[PDB]
């Protein structure tokens, strides 16, 4: 319905805003663009589902997220990819992991404080009906 399309439009606006706030955070610079195979050569073959904040924006705009839960699955993927690709004790690896965990925690904390749970419930019920 038209009221349902208004719901999903509000969801997209909310998701773009959260994503923009993560993207402008200096700690999350390495998550703002897809990992480049020329700069990180052993990546594209080891990480099956690459995910980053620009690809998240593209997915919002293509109407791929119908709930915050779907959006959070991709935020989780940015974090899980960094943990998987950088598992070593070395500082470089530990720094990416801390930044990935911090990006995930920040997205969840923003949504916990600003997302009305009845708004999410409505999105989930429209999604389940389709």
- What is d(CA 92, CA 89) in angstroms, rounded to the nearest whole number? 9
Q: Residue 94, interface with ligand 93L (CB under 6 A)? A: no
Task: Determine which residue in the list 16, 30, 72, 80 makes contact with ligand 93L, applying CB under 6 A.
Answer: 30
Task: Determine which residue in the list 5, 36, 84, 105 makes contact with ligand 93L, applying CB under 6 A.
Answer: 36
CB 53 within 8 A of CB 23: yes
CB atoms within 10 A of CB 8: 16
Six-digit token pair at 86? Answer: 């950088």
CB of 28 to ligand 93L, least distance (A): 9
Six-digit token pair at 18? Answer: 């959260």
- What is d(CA 76, CA 43) in angstroms, rounded to the nearest whole number? 18
CB 12 within 8 A of CB 71: no
CB of 34 to ligand 93L, least distance (A): 7
CB 11 within 8 A of CB 123: yes
- What is d(CA 8, CA 64) in angstroms, rounded to the nearest whole number? 10
Q: Residue 40, interface with ligand 93L (CB under 6 A)? A: yes
Closer to ligand 93L at the Cβ: 6 or 36? 36
Q: Residue 82, interface with ligand 93L (CB under 6 A)? A: yes
Q: Which stretch binds ligand 93L (CB under 6 A): 59-67, 81-89, 106-114, 119-127?
A: 81-89
CB of 77 to ligand 93L, least distance (A): 11
Q: Which residues make up the interface to ligand 93L (CB under 6 A)? A: 29-33, 35-36, 39-40, 82, 85-86, 92-93, 96
């Amino acid at each position: 319905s038209m009221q349902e399309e208004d719901t999903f439009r509000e969801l997209r606006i909310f998701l773009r805003n959260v994503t923009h706030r993560l993207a402008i955070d200096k700690r999350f610079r390495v998550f703002t663009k897809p990992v480049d195979p020329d700069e990180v050569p052993d990546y594209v073959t080891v990480i099956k589902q690459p995910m980053d904040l620009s690809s998240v924006i593209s997915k919002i705009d293509l109407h791929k997220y119908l709930t915050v839960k779907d959006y959070l699955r991709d935020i989780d993927l940015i974090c899980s990819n960094a943990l998987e690709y950088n598992p070593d004790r070395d500082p470089g690896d530990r720094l990416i992991r801390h930044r990935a965990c911090a990006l995930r925690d920040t997205a969840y904390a923003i949504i916990k404080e600003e997302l009305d749970e009845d708004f999410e419930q409505l999105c989930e019920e429209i999604q389940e009906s389709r």
